[PDB]
Amino acid sequence: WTLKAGALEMALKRVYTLLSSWNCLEDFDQIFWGQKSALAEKVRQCWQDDELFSYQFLNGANPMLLRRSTSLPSRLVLPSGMEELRAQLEKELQNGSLFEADFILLDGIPAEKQYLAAPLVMLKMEPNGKLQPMVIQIQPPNPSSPTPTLFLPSDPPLAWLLAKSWVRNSDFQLHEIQYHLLNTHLVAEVIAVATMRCLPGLHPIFKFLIPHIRYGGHVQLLRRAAAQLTYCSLCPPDDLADRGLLGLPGALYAHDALRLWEIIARYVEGIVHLFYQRDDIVKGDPELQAWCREITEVGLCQAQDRGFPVSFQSQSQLCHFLTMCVFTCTAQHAAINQGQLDWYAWVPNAPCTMRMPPPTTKEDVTMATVMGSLPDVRQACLQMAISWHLSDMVPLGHHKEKYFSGPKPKAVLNQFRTDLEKLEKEITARNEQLDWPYEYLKPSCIENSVT
Ligand SMILES: [Fe+3]
């Protein structure tokens, strides 16, 4: 249950075992014959469009990587005689308009033989709202490349596509290992056990948390991910702030996540201020304090060097942490998981595996090269299988149970529902006006727990 060695290696096996059970004709019709999503069908036809490539960094299956650059990455070595790329990256950084998708956590991992790369994409945002790519670097510098080729939108079309496609494969990897398995599922397992371990069932925050938690490499990558898991990464206000995605009107994941955070927060602090009336109570609850330590020190593996608390000194310190717990188990899993059907069905747009190494030049890139690198029918079709299965339930805030008895808690949970209905009708109204709606965080679509 920990994030050790170790435990993480056992996690991946249990995941393969689950996925294996869908390697059969279980929903074959549905699947490979039935109607695919409206968005899936949109992706199929626009996937080569540079804007659709870019757009996904904001509102696709994985909107957790993109960042607004403050300086140009040290890995982005620009060869002599690209004064123009130089000047344009400079222009954008000075304008506060330069963004990046840096896939470095993959650097150095090897991957039935699959090839990995650790690319960097630099994108500009124009007043429009729209993100346009400027340059892809597929491998980082290292000490016999010196100056990795820089692939550009103006290059031989099939080279630009191969470059982009490697970026999507890399996005596929980080998305599933880091942002889905680790950050939602495995962090959920830590929260869950630690609740079971340190808090008796009638402990108020056990009652609060419970409706949300019943119950090679890869290995390399998952270990590194778990290594750099910070507390702020799991908190939208912090996270969207640390990545410069605040004040971005077309950042719909960002908007929705943040608007949910405020709902969860208000619901959280409402319940907390009832039981822990004042900071003194929080500080003095020894069980809660064990529960905190159990998550940060044991479960997350000495995670107190990555923003995580070792104690709760106050209501605010506890509400912030309790809001992170709900969000991780509910909203964020919704955001990370609900998009596989839409974005990963059309396999060329999110290739699960690449079967050749990345190109070192932009020269001699052929359909043979492209088709050779992209997955095969078997890999690609099993991809589609799993993504459909992944993407009856109890929605967020609707645990048809009453662990709390008073009218005071009931009022709190009642406002939560009202605010959730408020966001619901807001999201659905916005989405109606858009060709590319975002709906992985509509409150009704979020399950009251990771399952
Ligand atoms: Fe999941």
UniProtKB/Swiss-Prot annotation:
GO terms for cellular component: cytoplasm; cytosol; extracellular exosome; membrane; sarcolemma. The keyword Transmembrane does not apply. Optimum pH is 7.5-8.0 (for arachidonate 12-lipoxygenase activity). Induction: Down-regulated upon starvation, by UV-irradiation and 15-lipoxygenase metabolites. Expressed in vascular smooth muscle cells. Keywords: Cytoplasm, Dioxygenase, Fatty acid metabolism, Hydrolase, Iron, Lipid metabolism, Membrane, Metal-binding, Oxidoreductase, Phosphoprotein. Catalyzes the regio and stereo-specific incorporation of molecular oxygen into free and esterified polyunsaturated fatty acids generating lipid hydroperoxides that can be further reduced to the corresponding hydroxy species. Mainly converts arachidonate ((5Z,8Z,11Z,14Z)-eicosatetraenoate) to the specific bioactive lipid (12S)-hydroperoxyeicosatetraenoate/(12S)-HPETE. Through the production of bioactive lipids like (12S)-HPETE it regulates different biological processes including platelet activation. It is linked to Esophageal cancer: A malignancy of the esophagus. The most common types are esophageal squamous cell carcinoma and adenocarcinoma. Cancer of the esophagus remains a devastating disease because it is usually not detected until it has progressed to an advanced incurable stage. This is Polyunsaturated fatty acid lipoxygenase ALOX12. The gene is ALOX12. The chain holds residues 176 to 662 of 663 of the full protein.
